Amino acid sequence: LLGTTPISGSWVSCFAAEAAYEFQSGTGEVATFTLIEQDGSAYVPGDRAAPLGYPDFSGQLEIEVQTETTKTGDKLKVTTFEMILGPTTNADQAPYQGRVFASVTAAASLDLVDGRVRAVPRSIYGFQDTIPEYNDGLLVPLAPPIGPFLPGEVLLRFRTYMRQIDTADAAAEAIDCALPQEFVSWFASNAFTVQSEALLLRYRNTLTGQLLFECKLYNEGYIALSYSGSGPLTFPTDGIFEVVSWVPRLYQLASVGS
Amino acid sequence: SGQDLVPAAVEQAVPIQPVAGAALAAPAAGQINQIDPWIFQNFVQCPLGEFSISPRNTPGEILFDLALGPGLNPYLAHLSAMYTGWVGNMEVQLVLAGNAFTAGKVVVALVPPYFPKGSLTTAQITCFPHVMCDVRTLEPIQLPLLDVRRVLWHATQDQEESMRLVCMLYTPLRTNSPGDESFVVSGRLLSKPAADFNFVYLTPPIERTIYRMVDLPVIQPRLCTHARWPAPVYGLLVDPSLPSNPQWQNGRVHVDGTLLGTTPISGSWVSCFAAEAAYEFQSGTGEVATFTLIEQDGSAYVPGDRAAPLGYPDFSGQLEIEVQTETTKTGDKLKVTTFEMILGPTTNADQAPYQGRVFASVTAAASLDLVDGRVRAVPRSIYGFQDTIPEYNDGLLVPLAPPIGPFLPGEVLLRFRTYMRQIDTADAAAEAIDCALPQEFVSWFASNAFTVQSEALLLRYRNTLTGQLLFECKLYNEGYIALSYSGSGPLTFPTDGIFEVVSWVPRLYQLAS
Amino acid sequence: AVPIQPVAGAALAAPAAGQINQIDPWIFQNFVQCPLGEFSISPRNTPGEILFDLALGPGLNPYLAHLSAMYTGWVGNMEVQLVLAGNAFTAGKVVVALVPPYFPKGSLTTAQITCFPHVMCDVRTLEPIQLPLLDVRRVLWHATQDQEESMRLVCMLYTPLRTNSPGDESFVVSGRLLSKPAADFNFVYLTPPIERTIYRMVDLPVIQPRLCTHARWPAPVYGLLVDPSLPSNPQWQNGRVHVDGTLLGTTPISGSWVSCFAAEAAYEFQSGTGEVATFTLIEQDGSAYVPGDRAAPLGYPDFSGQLEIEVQTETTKTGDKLKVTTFEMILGPTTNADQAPYQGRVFASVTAAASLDLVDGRVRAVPRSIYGFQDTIPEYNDGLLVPLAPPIGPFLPGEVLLRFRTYMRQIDTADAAAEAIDCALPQEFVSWFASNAFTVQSEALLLRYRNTLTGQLLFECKLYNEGYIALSYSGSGPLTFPTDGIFEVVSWVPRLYQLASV
Numbered sequence A: 001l002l003g004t005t006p007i008s009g010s011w012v013s014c015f016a017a018e019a020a021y022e023f024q025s026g027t028g029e030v031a032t033f034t035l036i037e038q039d040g041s042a043y044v045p046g047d048r049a050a051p052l053g054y055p056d057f058s059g060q061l062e063i064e065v066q067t068e069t070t071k072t073g074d075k076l077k078v079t080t081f082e083m084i085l086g087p088t089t090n091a092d093q094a095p096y097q098g099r100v101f102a103s104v105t106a107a108a109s110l111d112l113v114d115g116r117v118r119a120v121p122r123s124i125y126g127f128q129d130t131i132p133e134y135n136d137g138l139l140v141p142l143a144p145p146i147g148p149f150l151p152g153e154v155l156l157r158f159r160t161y162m163r164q165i166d167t168a169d170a171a172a173e174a175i176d177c178a179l180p181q182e183f184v185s186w187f188a189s190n191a192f193t194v195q196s197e198a199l200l201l202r203y204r205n206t207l208t209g210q211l212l213f214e215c216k217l218y219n220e221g222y223i224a225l226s227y228s229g230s231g232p233l234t235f236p237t238d239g240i241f242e243v244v245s246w247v248p249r250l251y252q253l254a255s256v257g258s
Numbered sequence B: 001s002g003q004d005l006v007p008a009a010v011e012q013a014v015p016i017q018p019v020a021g022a023a024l025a026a027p028a029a030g031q032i033n034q035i036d037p038w039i040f041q042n043f044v045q046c047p048l049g050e051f052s053i054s055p056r057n058t059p060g061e062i063l064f065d066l067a068l069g070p071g072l073n074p075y076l077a078h079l080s081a082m083y084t085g086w087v088g089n090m091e092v093q094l095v096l097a098g099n100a101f102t103a104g105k106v107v108v109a110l111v112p113p114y115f116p117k118g119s120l121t122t123a124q125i126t127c128f129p130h131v132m133c134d135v136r137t138l139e140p141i142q143l144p145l146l147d148v149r150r151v152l153w154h155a156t157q158d159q160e161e162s163m164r165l166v167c168m169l170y171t172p173l174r175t176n177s178p179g180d181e182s183f184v185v186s187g188r189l190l191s192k193p194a195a196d197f198n199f200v201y202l203t204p205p206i207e208r209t210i211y212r213m214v215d216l217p218v219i220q221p222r223l224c225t226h227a228r229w230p231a232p233v234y235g236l237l238v239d240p241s242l243p244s245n246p247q248w249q250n251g252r253v254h255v256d257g258t259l260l261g262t263t264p265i266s267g268s269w270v271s272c273f274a275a276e277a278a279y280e281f282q283s284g285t286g287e288v289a290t291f292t293l294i295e296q297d298g299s300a301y302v303p304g305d306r307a308a309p310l311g312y313p314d315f316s317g318q319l320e321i322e323v324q325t326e327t328t329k330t331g332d333k334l335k336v337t338t339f340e341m342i343l344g345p346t347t348n349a350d351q352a353p354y355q356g357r358v359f360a361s362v363t364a365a366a367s368l369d370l371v372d373g374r375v376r377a378v379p380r381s382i383y384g385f386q387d388t389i390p391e392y393n394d395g396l397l398v399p400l401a402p403p404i405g406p407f408l409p410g411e412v413l414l415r416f417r418t419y420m421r422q423i424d425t426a427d428a429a430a431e432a433i434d435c436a437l438p439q440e441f442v443s444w445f446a447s448n449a450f451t452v453q454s455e456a457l458l459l460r461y462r463n464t465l466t467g468q469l470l471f472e473c474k475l476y477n478e479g480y481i482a483l484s485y486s487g488s489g490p491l492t493f494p495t496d497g498i499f500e501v502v503s504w505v506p507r508l509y510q511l512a513s
Numbered sequence C: 001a002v003p004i005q006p007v008a009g010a011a012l013a014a015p016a017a018g019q020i021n022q023i024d025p026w027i028f029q030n031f032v033q034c035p036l037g038e039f040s041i042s043p044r045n046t047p048g049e050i051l052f053d054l055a056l057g058p059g060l061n062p063y064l065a066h067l068s069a070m071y072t073g074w075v076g077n078m079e080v081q082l083v084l085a086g087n088a089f090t091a092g093k094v095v096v097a098l099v100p101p102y103f104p105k106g107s108l109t110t111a112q113i114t115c116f117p118h119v120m121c122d123v124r125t126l127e128p129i130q131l132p133l134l135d136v137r138r139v140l141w142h143a144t145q146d147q148e149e150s151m152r153l154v155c156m157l158y159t160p161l162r163t164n165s166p167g168d169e170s171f172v173v174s175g176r177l178l179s180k181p182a183a184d185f186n187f188v189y190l191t192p193p194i195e196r197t198i199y200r201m202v203d204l205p206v207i208q209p210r211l212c213t214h215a216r217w218p219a220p221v222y223g224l225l226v227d228p229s230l231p232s233n234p235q236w237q238n239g240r241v242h243v244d245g246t247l248l249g250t251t252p253i254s255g256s257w258v259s260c261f262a263a264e265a266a267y268e269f270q271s272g273t274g275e276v277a278t279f280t281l282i283e284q285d286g287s288a289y290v291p292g293d294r295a296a297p298l299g300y301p302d303f304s305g306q307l308e309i310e311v312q313t314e315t316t317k318t319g320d321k322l323k324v325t326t327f328e329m330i331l332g333p334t335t336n337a338d339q340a341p342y343q344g345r346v347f348a349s350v351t352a353a354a355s356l357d358l359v360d361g362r363v364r365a366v367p368r369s370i371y372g373f374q375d376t377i378p379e380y381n382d383g384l385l386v387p388l389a390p391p392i393g394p395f396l397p398g399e400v401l402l403r404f405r406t407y408m409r410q411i412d413t414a415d416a417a418a419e420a421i422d423c424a425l426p427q428e429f430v431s432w433f434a435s436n437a438f439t440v441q442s443e444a445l446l447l448r449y450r451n452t453l454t455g456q457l458l459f460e461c462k463l464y465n466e467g468y469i470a471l472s473y474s475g476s477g478p479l480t481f482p483t484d485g486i487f488e489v490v491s492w493v494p495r496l497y498q499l500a501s502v
């Protein structure tokens, strides 16, 4: 694995922490989360830039927590909070160090206990694909950029649409990844060798055996595709990638036609 | 060492002539094909080569039943991906060397081809060339396995009619030993090709063959995801004071790949659904969001052999969810909301997800108008969790997946436990939902579609920090795991070690407690 | 017996070695025991257990492990024999297989052990199973001073053990492996004998613990004891070392560096609670300190409380020049402290009423006492990262740490009972293990506390190769031992080796 990538498809873009609740009447509940590993183990700062699975996109984030309270009429409850992932140039958030601050718009002083929590993404405001604040203002270790490519190759992107709080626009907030789950698992479960610099995949539709395209899965876990067009070009998502061979770095893919 | 046992069951003159191996199929294949002369030199244990005779077995039970083939050798089951054909005999050793106090006899027959499969009672297993061997014999019992065949060679695809080798518990197993324990003689099977075994026609070596015993992922069962609720796994355990044969619907998959009921492959469909919404505001219950259900990948839902779309919450309770709805108010456009739909009958209902329609509702003061669209609802909380099947059709029967069973006397179910977010106004403990196999194994069997051999797989559970085998469980070919446990208090296991298959075992295989 | 060709030993390696050196012919006579070549099969074991796994070399024989410091190489086979201790009423098998000198690693299931050239031994055999251990190799000879890949013997429990058992013990079937050189073992080239070899067993200092020095607080050691009540898995940062000679965390070589720091004097007066000095930490040897792997400079205290360094104060005020004042330092969080030794800055505060005209220079600090001492990690950073040594574990079921308690100078206002700090290894072992740099063989030593005057054991403890001692205790009351004995290494054991209850 590289960066903060988890194995489970359920560790993604969430954290687990030992919460601490204090400004109980200024703005609401300002919770400080001492992050640990989601499997329960204690987080120790090494070469990953955050716990395993921590959200690496920038923007405000909503999280669902479990809140053991003390008031009569309710013992447990799910609570929404406010997370500030983006840089913002003023934020006491240091996921690399192990402390993360979230807040609630609350006029009262709903008091909770300091038990453990498994937070969950709910909705992102002002989404933006760029490295969030990992330290408070300082540099961290993190995975290298996704490159390089031969002259003529673009990056094949997998595209999913998220939940977004939006005041004006009404379009879908597309986020893009290199490999989906079931590919990050199925790696790191059976450990393959490499024997060369890329894999020549062959995407073809399971009906009629039509050949959609032919891509290079570079050994760093991302797919390049020799596309010389200008705008986007979407493919159907009901085919099956099939490994054809290992190809050197210089191999020249057949162009795809927009 | 003592010789109050049976010296050797030296293979009686079984009434059978010698059978030709590769000398008949040699002028009919267009290749000269030989296999390593060192594979014929040692007896290695079969892939299906592990059985056990307990005293709870009755005369007539079939201990092992293995057709002559290349599936009788780990060496030749691997070499038989490159070839299309085989011929020849095999030599099988049978290792039962039970205690000095046990008593009983097994009888190993030589069933010819085309003999109807099925019952094979104890009165008729002796009419075949057989060997009656005591379960105390010290030295292994070499017994042949001839290639009686109608044709020149067999194709390496199991639809062949080939000579079986059935073993049957002839007299029951008892023990003289004066103390409070009946030993469980556990035999093994070793095999090696005879002098003229031979494969036929080199072909491309494909991994997805009828051999190639099941593999499991090397991932700890605490990094795995759950198959009934979107969360990690927080500990596997065995509990005898629970519903023993439950009728869950998610995370239930055969070993040969075919999913069962409402189970998805993707781990983000579980407990979620995708529908087309219609919101209607009421002065009472607030909105009444009618959802017409489609599949989570886009295709429409036609009610067939599944009691609900793939991934519908298969339990009963009060599920509060999250949908991104578009409003008509000016100032904001997109908003994630929280409706609250029932699943338990609650003495009154209107939803029938078998027909493709559910009814959520939220209580709000204003006449909250929303842009009627299509949404993906994911769970957020559960209030009053009940581990029972909901009403998929209103009160009508639905096509369901069978309840998880049956187990041998003594075998409890191994449950993977995870805690869901709950709304308890008085209770303070944790609600726990249990699955049979995590979603990481359902996504692993769907993608490989193995060829199950008999009825179940031995497993282990190897610790990863100490290399210590904690227990051996039995994965039944219907995708659940039974382990022997006679205790009363719920026993819990470390969640670090990884599983690992061992062999195929029949249903009668008695485990170690 | 076994399906292997005969493997040429010293006849393939002869035309390319300067010499082929013979061995005393009385060494090919005795079967001497192999280190780690012992097991025990209880009736609770599942088939698949790996009972032993040992690699052909000269480390299997005490004669050859010692002869193999005079030479450069070796070649040839060995003869091993497995003895099993079971009567006529047991039942179970054990498969002994010859694993080639590659074939990487992992859980060998019992399906796969029968695929090597093997031997399947019933538990109730009489005479010892003899089997070869051939030298399959890619090269002509082997080098004695460099562990390489050679043929293994792996033993596995094939079918489980079926016996009766009275009430205690539970009838384990024991087994022991004993080896000797085959007729064509040879060493290669006579060199001058070296002492820092790799088949050199871990020896311990002959020093009673009462004469030792503590590792976390600079004082003598006043009592070694077990105590199932305290935190069973602490995370101390001083007195951590690896038996292979690697210092873990902020453990220093010397005992003068313990609970101490050499700092930069940055003095300035303030009219609040007194004088406050900010210290820019450095390594006490005088080398420039940079934030690295350790959670603090080497030796910085690892407890939590109110510590009071002394000085290096040069006062230019007339009357006196060099004095010894007592500062004060807070180690616990207290929710108001800029305590970050990690980055190289600490805050010290003395309660003075006037200005102390102190020159800025280079000081070093000595603890005086502690107020409110808690066995808990201090603030190496404010609330931030700390790359630190892991906790001290894990232990088997029913094993508790063996602590070397000393008593530190307590400033108290409510009682007088002396408080006990404690470490896992006195500061003599931390220097011994680093100065020798042994070679860890398996997983855990097997010490033996004896009395030098009387000559009788006190207990059998277990030094894990991670630098702490465990001990199989059953009861619950703190049981204190005499502090006048000697630790004696017996042999290497596995992790799962079960001690004798103290």
Ligand SMILES: C[C@H](CCC(=O)NCCS(=O)(=O)O)[C@H]1CC[C@H]2[C@@H]3[C@H](O)C[C@@H]4C[C@H](O)CC[C@]4(C)[C@H]3C[C@H](O)[C@]12C
Pocket (backbone or CB within 6 Å): A016, A017, A036, A037, A038, A039, A040, A041, A066, A115, A116, A117, A118, A119, A120, B229, B230, B231, B234, B379, B380, B418, B419, B420, B421, B430
């Ligand atoms: C209050 C938690 C129950 C909620 C939950 O488990 N998942 C909700 C997310 S989702 O909507 O189902 O997607 C409990 C159940 C299991 C707990 C965890 C488990 O106790 C394991 C670790 C270890 C420590 O207890 C503390 C952190 C922890 C990680 C715990 C956090 C938290 O106390 C958890 C997560």
Ligand SMILES: C[C@H](CCC(=O)NCCS(=O)(=O)O)[C@H]1CC[C@H]2[C@@H]3[C@H](O)C[C@@H]4C[C@H](O)CC[C@]4(C)[C@H]3C[C@H](O)[C@]12C
Pocket (backbone or CB within 6 Å): A161, A162, A163, A172, A173, B274, B294, B296, B297, B298, B299, B323, B324, B374, B375, B376, B377, B378
């Ligand atoms: C409701 C979706 C937009 C909001 C969103 O991105 N997420 C909401 C919850 S989640 O984060 O997806 O978990 C919309 C945008 C993308 C849509 C999907 C896409 O249009 C693809 C297919 C198209 C089919 O006609 C309908 C189902 C569908 C599978 C759509 C379902 C659903 O209407 C989706 C998912």
Ligand SMILES: C[C@H](CCC(=O)NCCS(=O)(=O)O)[C@H]1CC[C@H]2[C@@H]3[C@H](O)C[C@@H]4C[C@H](O)CC[C@]4(C)[C@H]3C[C@H](O)[C@]12C
Pocket (backbone or CB within 6 Å): C260, C262, C284, C285, C286, C310, C311, C312, C362, C363, C364, C365, C366, C367
């Ligand atoms: C302030 C030091 C005097 C010794 C002292 O104050 N106490 C010793 C006992 S205790 O621990 O305080 O308990 C002086 C005398 C020896 C000096 C050191 C020595 O001169 C060695 C190096 C020399 C470098 O030029 C500067 C740093 C240094 C490391 C010096 C630091 C500091 O000036 C020291 C340490």
